[PDB]
Amino acid sequence: KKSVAMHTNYLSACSFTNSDMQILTASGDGTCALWDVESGQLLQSFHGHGADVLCLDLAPSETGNTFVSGGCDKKAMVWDMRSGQCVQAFETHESDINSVRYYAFASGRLYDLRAD
Amino acid sequence: RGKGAYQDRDKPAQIRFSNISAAKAVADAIRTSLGPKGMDKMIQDGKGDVTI
Amino acid sequence: ASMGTLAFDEYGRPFLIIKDQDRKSRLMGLEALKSHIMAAKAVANTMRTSLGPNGLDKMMVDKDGDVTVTNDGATILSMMDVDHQIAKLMVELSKSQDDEIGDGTTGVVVLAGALLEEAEQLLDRGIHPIRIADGYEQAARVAIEHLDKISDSVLVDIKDTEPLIQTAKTTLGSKVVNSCHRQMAEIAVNAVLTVADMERRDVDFELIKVEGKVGGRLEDTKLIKGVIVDKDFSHPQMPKKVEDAKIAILTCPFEPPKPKTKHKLDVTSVEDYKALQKYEKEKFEEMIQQIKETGANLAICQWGFDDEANHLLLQNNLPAVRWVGGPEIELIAIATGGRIVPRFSELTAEKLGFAGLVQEISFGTTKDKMLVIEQCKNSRAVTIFIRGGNKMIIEEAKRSLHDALCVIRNLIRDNRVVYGGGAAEISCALAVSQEADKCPTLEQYAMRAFADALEVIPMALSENSGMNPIQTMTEVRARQVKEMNPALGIDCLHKGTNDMKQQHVIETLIGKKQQISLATQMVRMILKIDDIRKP
Amino acid sequence: ASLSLAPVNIFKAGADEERAETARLTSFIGAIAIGDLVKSTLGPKGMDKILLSSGRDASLMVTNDGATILKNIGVDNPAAKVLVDMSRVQDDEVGDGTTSVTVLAAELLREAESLIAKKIHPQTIIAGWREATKAAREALLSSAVDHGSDEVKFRQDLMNIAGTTLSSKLLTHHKDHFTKLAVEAVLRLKGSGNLEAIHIIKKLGGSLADSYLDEGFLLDKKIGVNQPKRIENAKILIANTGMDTDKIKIFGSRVRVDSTAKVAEIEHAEKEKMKEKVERILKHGINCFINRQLIYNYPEQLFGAAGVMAIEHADFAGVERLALVTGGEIASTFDHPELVKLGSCKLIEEVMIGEDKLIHFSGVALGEACTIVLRGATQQILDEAERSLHDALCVLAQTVKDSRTVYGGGCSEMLMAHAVTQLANRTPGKEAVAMESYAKALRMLPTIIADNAGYDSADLVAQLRAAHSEGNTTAGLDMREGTIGDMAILGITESFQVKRQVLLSAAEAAEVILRVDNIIKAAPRK
């Protein structure tokens, strides 16, 4: 097992990426983190989203480059590995999104990426 | 002339005194462990770890 | 009079009719009407202090602690946490007025409250509420006919926008942007006129993008005949400014093609691996060359792309931006005159949009960048970029400019205006008063009460401006009766004259008609209700 | 009647409502409390604050910055929220003036409370304040002086502005050294406004005077194992490629064979692909290689055998800064060596700063990116030094953008207030009283500046007012001894943009808060 345990705060969700090479983690401070299983280095930490993240979803058709994160900011915001930026965000949710399902993705309100 | 500024607010003086008191307390706490005749301290963490 | 009924039978046996009837409340008859009238009066009296140029603001705090300082009545009532059902009816009435017109969301509540306040003393004298509602409907019909009679027409030509500017200024005069009043009116009028189906058809607000960023000043708010995006050039080393850009809009990520169906590509030999690697490299090179062959100077995607495509775009002098949203893609395509191409193989020169200037804009010591597309040929989309000293005034400016755009849209739909400042209400009250003198006396009380309720707007305007309400209203009414001039209103700004024609206080006739109609129907419903059965 | 004071209750449980008296009272109390809290940290003799977090981390920080003080406080008063947002937006627009704008808004709202007590309608106050703001802005613009033509005069103005900005912070101990530091750092940007190109490294230990601006660049990354640790006349190649189990982006591809010999052959083919990638990179003729992403063991040993120093995991900011300082191009394909330019520097080596090892780029080609090393006795000292440098660099960059300068030390406030008083003296009605209160708040600003120093604020303010009314338009407070003097001679200058923004934002927020006559709260979730 990886059992890395490099984390100052607790882990709301530790979602293993679809690519069998790296893991995606989000701490209790609302910042997501990407770790390489082989090397162990933290590739990049995602700022913003001040309240703690609560769900992590990678892209379903492999494509280990984009993911969506939601937490207590009542936000549904999408990232990108190749730039480390919030490429897309949503505002419909208003209460501490618990779990998110990737279809577009349904979170608890079905969002569509092609039309925002 | 005579009297200068009144300095109505008393909080800054209290803050300075409290800061100095805390620093002096820390210095007095660790004074006993100074020099070749100084002696060690045993510190027990909340988790139960013990360090001398 | 409350809790329902409690009998437990005349034989002592249990008498249960409705589930949980012991913990359910009930109001019957006239007391329910009085409670509803009192609640509506409270709501209207809360609203009336934010009416007119001298009206004050309400500072709304939601459940999360976010603060919204605003003057829009519809916004205030929407953000107001009420529990009384009649208050919810008032909130829905304000929302209805906002949806139908966009302006006058505060006048409707005051008018309905005045109508119900008069209906209270009418009910106290033993008149059936249905008769009061019928009299109110008759008086509302008379007032609407009088408004149509005294209405005046304005020209909605693009060559002469002065009446439109004056109407927008009148709309904005009660908001916090009255410091930038004329500039705000100018940009609202130009934004509406730039994007509008000229043959008196609809105005599509989807093509008016209102964006606000903190910093700067209110005077820095400007109308941009293009699209403002919250993105930037993907590679940090591409130029920040492109002139005479030939824009290529794409919705295909600059990645190797991927079938939608579940697909597995089998590699069974070293030659297969080499062929796949060469296929990847050639796909990247071919897509970049296809983009370049059309002669485009700037490429816009929607789904982002990877490092190889980014460096190829930089290497070939092709500035590009990625992850542009769908609505922003549509706006860019509309403004630049270019089509949206779903894949590189369909990208031709004729599908390229054109922009006179594409620039990246900094915002001081904030690291944030925004893309600007403007100087198009015949751009059919506009962007209003609002700057301010804090987010709260930015939101207020957003809703104020929305009010101005809605008013100009109403002018587009119908070009008949009525002079405001209480002149319209006073003239309608006078018309109702003359009509009531000929009516049989039984509906006369309802019609006179309707006239008195209509007279509340000039009183509220006078009281907000510090003038004595009754004296000012009586003087203005006497002047209107003496000299036939339905343009005399309340001098809220103390300009020295009571004539709103020279003061250029202009209101759309459609707005006043909608106000009167909606208030009358809501009052009719509230009068028709006689029971409440809350749990 | 009233929404709350009615026989029938129209609200949910927990919802509240405050009418004119209560709304104005709460707004004024919140604004005045915020202004009093943030003040006393104003002027050269201002003091710092301790911000103790109540959370699990219990983060500790000492600061003189108004924006950071207002950010990290639990605020329930909505008007206080308005002022906090004002301070944050002021910080975003320009680096300084966060405390001044908040104090000005608080004083304006206090004067508004007095005027309301004097039975003056708030609309009249707002109109008078709009007129006063227009007059004060016109006067301040007319007083502005531009030195952007002469290079020596502009450099002197930049030095004075940096010194004035740093005078109120903890860096005032070594103001001269830190002023030289900030001016050199900003001038090295070659006109660009990119403040992210200046990297501040905080290393514990040493004195605060040990801080310095590196003549080249410093990177906090590591070198590979077998790669050289020292390169002279480096040929930099900055990349953003994979170099880590680099897989074909055809994610539907898989290896499906009938024997392990074919699997071994495919593995050798993958290794050969990586070797060919490294050979293509090396064909550029380079001595150093910086990749944004990770570099795995096989490319690491290939670079080591090639005798090329390869730096891995230099983040987006890192590769951008290296591109800015060395002139290289961030590449991702290496099929065209002649179309990619390479960064260059005289020497790269490893240096020790405290107990950590960093990579040093010396004799850089362009140098449009700076690394400032901060040495301090405590973490709080390092954080405050970083914040003070941020303020100084932001103000210097704004002055580079717009070279117009105005005199500080209360001179601009006195001039604007004198103009406002002149306007009010010729205006009839209560608007004159409103403008007089506006000018009174403008006076109160340097009054607080002098009070923080323990001086005789009343006498100094009276002398400044008399001098400005006489015609001495450059008179200002002299905090060295506590008299008045010529700000032009004494060299207290400020960015015209900063004071204009402070005045306009303060007036705007005061008008926004004053317009409120009712506060309605929804039921909180808790």
Ligand SMILES: Nc1ncnc2c1ncn2[C@@H]1O[C@H](COP(=O)(O)OP(=O)(O)O)[C@@H](O)[C@H]1O
């Ligand atoms: N310059 C003015 N002079 C007199 N009355 C005005 C003036 N500007 C606006 N009003 C009046 O103020 C009233 C309120 O308008 P406003 O507050 O902008 O929107 P709402 O009608 O939703 O309250 C309008 O009925 C209008 O007649």
Ligand SMILES: Nc1ncnc2c1ncn2[C@@H]1O[C@H](COP(=O)(O)OP(=O)(O)O)[C@@H](O)[C@H]1O
């Ligand atoms: N050397 C100086 N002499 C006189 N006044 C000064 C000097 N340095 C700074 N000030 C004044 O101190 C005021 C407060 O600046 P400061 O406390 O650094 O942050 P802020 O500008 O955000 O309030 C400025 O308005 C400036 O006029």
Ligand SMILES: [Mg+2]
């Ligand atoms: Mg209106």
Ligand SMILES: [Mg+2]
């Ligand atoms: Mg300062």
